[PDB]
Amino acid sequence: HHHHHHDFHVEEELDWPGVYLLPGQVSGVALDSKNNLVIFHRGDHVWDGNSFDSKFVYQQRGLGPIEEDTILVIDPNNAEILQSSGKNLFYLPHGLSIDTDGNYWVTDVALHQVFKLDPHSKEGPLLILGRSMQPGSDQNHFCQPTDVAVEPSTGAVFVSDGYCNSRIVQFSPSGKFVTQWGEESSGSSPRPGQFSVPHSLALVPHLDQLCVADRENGRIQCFKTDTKEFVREIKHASFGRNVFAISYIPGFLFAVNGKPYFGDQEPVQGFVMNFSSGEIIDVFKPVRKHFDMPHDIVASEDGTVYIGDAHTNTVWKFTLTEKMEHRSV
Ligand SMILES: [Ca+2]
Ligand SMILES: [Fe+3]
Ligand SMILES: [Zn+2]
To answer: So which residues have sugars stuck on them?
Structure first.
């Protein structure tokens, strides 16, 4: 604020070779305890108009599951693939997050399910939530579930359930339904506690909060994690129509929006917000390749930010910095 604008800026790390990877649609990103990037991709499977019918049931079961490894851990420096798994399990990968023990938490929009996986196991999922290929809206069904966040202090499993639902569901560490909140965003304006496609979750550990990217409303909703009380709404004209994904590190909320329609004024970008005020302090995009559907984002306390694209099938590494003078502008 000494010069006209703001001093924090996010910039692509150009010496990171992970941009040269050729995965399928990249649906989820996360960081493991060694700060390695972990991605969740769709191989040769694509989400299109012939994937689901009118009742949200998956059409291409006979093509089988994705045959190639679907989860990759990627070195933060040389971008080499350190390990891979997720072979012969998934149909349309979506969310990926990692709990405090290092377990993977994954969602599938075709299966309508949520998986807990031990990364160092050879004997299949530790937990499966929801019913295979069966979309629903009760305590034991999902409808195209989008993301999962697991609270390190309680072990509470939160699932954002809604490309066709409008809820967040709490589960016990043993997979048992605890509680749920949220409903479809009502007539005229959308009111607090109402989702239209809860698409991304970020926990705020020491403020006991949970943040939700409401993609169709173009906004973020924050809730108190114990009481479920609506804390706050973040909405900016810069987002445009969508907020696809969010990530928290102390001090900052990071977000990606959606691609503009023809005529739209708001480009596709990463966003950096001051977490307290909720205000956008920085806007960014890659130098190599381009955003089309940036779909998930994960930030590290060390200042690293990763983004995966579900259309250009790419992951980028970025770095948050504060500089005395702005190299650009
Ligand atoms: Ca994620
Ligand atoms: Fe300044
Ligand atoms: Zn999605």
So the answer is: 274
